[PDB]
Structure formats: C-alpha cells, structure tokens
Design a binder for these strands. Structure first.
Ligand SMILES: [Mg+2]
Ligand SMILES: [Mg+2]
Ligand SMILES: [Mg+2]
Ligand SMILES: [Mg+2]
Ligand SMILES: [Mn+2]
Length: 292
DNA sequence: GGTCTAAACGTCGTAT
DNA sequence: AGGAGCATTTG
DNA sequence: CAAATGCTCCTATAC
DNA sequence: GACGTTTAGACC
C-alpha cells in the first residue's frame, strides 16, 4: 500500500537532511571537491519506511548497518528529489535549508562550481546550511559571508497527510502513569499525544494546534512540545485524525496499543486494579519497551 | 475531604 | 540528523 | 586526467 | 521522543 507525497515531505520536515560536503582534493583544479547530498537515516527497525519512500520516488540508495539510510547523491537522483519538494514544499525552517541546497545544486549541475567564483558562492550557502562552516573551513575560506537564510514564516498546513508524516517522525503516543495517593488504585492514568520541535518553529507548532483544534504549547528549556492531554480531544480529534491519516513505521503499533488503551480509560478500567494492571502490560510492550 | 482530570513541571539517553 | 573523506568508476 | 559518484566511517543534541 | 511527579481545581 503506497505512501502519500505529503506524508513524505511531512516526514522529511521531521527527519531528513540536505547537505553539502566541501573537501580538500588537490586532484581537482580548485583543489576542492564539492558535492550535494540528501539523506534520511534512522533505526534499522524502520528500513521499511525508507523502502516505501524508494518505491514512491523510484530513486535512492538504501543501506543498513549500524543504522538504516536512504541517500541521493547523484545528479539523476537529486533531480527526482527536487522535482518532489518543488511540487510538495517543506514548511519547517528546513525549507530555508532546502532553498540554499537547491541554489547550490544548480551551481553544481551547471558546472558553475568548477570555478573560484562558484566555489566561493557555494560556501556562502554551506555557511548558512545546517550546522554552518566548521573551524577549518572558516580558516580555509576566511571571513566568507553566510548567504541570506530565508526566515520561513506564515506557513499553512498544506495537507492532513503532512501532519501524519511529521508526527511519524517527531510525534509520540504514550500513556502516563502517575504515583498519586488520592486515586483508589494509587495511580493516575492518562493518554498523552505529543509533537516535539526546536523553538525556531514554535509558530508552526502554535497553528498545528489551530489545525487540530486541541493541545497546549509546552516550552522546556529550548524546545517546544505540542501536548494533548484532554481525553475528549484525544477521543474526538486525535484518534479519528490518525485513523484517517495513517502513521508509518513501527510507531503505527505504538499508536494501535495507545488507541486500545484510550478505550480502557474511556470505559474507566483505569480506576480498577485489574484495569491498571492490564494497561501497564500494554504500556510496557509499547514505545521504549517494544523489541525485535 | 474524597476522587478524579488536566496540565504544569521534570528528566533520561540515543535515534535521527 | 548531521557530518566528512577515501575508494572506485566515468567519460 | 579530473570530475562524479560509491561507500563507509565519525559526531552529538533535538527530540 | 518518552518516561516521571506535582499542582490547580472540578465535581460529588
Ligand atoms: Mg527533527
Ligand atoms: Mg522515530
Ligand atoms: Mg543534531
Ligand atoms: Mg529524535
Ligand atoms: Mn525526529
């Protein structure tokens, strides 16, 4: 069963990397090797997420050693990647990374990089890309101005599957058991839904809430969590949403278990000892407690 | 004051 | 998630 | 040859 | 990402 282009970019907003590697190479005429890359790497457990992305695009090399990756490094394969994101844009601050990457891509594809002028222009871009220029690259190209980075603002969720894609990456479905004397069982049971993202996209988080019509912002010193704790919102909004917009990967099974636990809470089995014991068993085979 | 939900407040460690 | 470079193939 | 791409190993904090 | 405890205060 094929994936949706929107869950792809959603997941890519969450997990993907756009990269430029600039390495010394005296064999080249500038003395420097310049290449672009696009990659997603994750736990071996989710090889099959990459496989469904590879089936979709018909491009990309998949590896599996200590982790599992899908990479696009040739021009032929990057054309496919750029055809994708021009048609289905990113909406996090990764958009800015992408626009820099795309800039550098054209330079390279057009061979404009085999040139002092090009090489320099490509560094301005690298300087503003993800982690910027390293201490040694800063030395090799002294006082090179970082290219202007688009501050990505006022973004509207383009498709509901974008959310399913993004929460497949940054989302979490867990059950919170709290030691509390004032409950007959001695514990509080709660269903929590969560999305996490660096504070630079707090704007985006704030209207995911508007999009879903539920949840609270939580700033932890920074990061931002979108947290839904309200049981009714989980019952009427979150579950039916993800029932329509499918999570991909192993998280699907955590979602199912979680969803099963919501029913139990809904039927109030969490207020009886047998209920609590049952939930604890499901919960312990869930997220961090699942296996091979 | 008993029982409970919501959510504020808190932290660990590795998948990404 | 993000990084860098040696190894090998290409034209 | 020199340029492109393959392959594989290093780093570390946003989730 | 996912696990844990404390606090505000609703409802009976
Ligand atoms: Mg991320
Ligand atoms: Mg994950
Ligand atoms: Mg990082
Ligand atoms: Mg993460
Ligand atoms: Mn992530």
């Amino acid at each position: 069963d094929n994936i949706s282009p929107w869950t792809i970019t959603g997941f890519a907003d969450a997990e993907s990397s756009f990269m430029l590697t600039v390495s010394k190479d005296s064999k080249r005429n500038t003395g420097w090797s310049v290449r672009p890359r696009f990659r997603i790497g994750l736990h071996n457990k989710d090889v099959t997420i990459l496989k469904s992305i590879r089936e979709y695009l018909g491009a990309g090399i998949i590896t599996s050693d200590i982790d599992a990756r899908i990479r696009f490094e040739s021009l032929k394969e990057l054309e496919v990647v750029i055809n994708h994101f021009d048609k289905y844009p990113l909406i996090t601050q990764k958009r800015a990374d992408y626009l820099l990457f795309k800039k550098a891509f054209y330079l390279i594809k057009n061979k404009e990089h085999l040139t002092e002028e090009g090489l320099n222009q490509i560094l301005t871009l690298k300087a503003s890309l993800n982690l910027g220029l390293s201490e040694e690259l800063k030395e090799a190209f002294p006082n090179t101005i970082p290219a202007e980075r688009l501050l990505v603002t006022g973004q509207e969720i383009p498709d509901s599957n974008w959310v399913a894609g993004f929460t497949a990456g940054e989302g979490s479905f867990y059950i919170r058991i709290a030691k509390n004397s004032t409950l007959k069982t001695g514990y509080q049971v709660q269903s929590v839904f969560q999305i996490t993202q660096d504070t630079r996209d707090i704007e985006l988080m704030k209207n995911l809430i508007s999009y879903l019509n539920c949840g609270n912002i939580r700033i932890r010193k920074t990061c931002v969590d979108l947290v839904v704790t309200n049981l009714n919102d989980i019952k009427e909004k979150i579950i039916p949403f993800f029932n329509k917009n499918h999570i991909i990967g192993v998280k699907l099974q955590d979602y199912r278990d979680w969803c099963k636990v919501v029913t139990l809470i809904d039927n109030k089995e969490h207020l009886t000892s047998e209920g609590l014991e049952k939930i604890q068993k499901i919960k312990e085979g869930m997220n961090r407690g699942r296996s091979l």
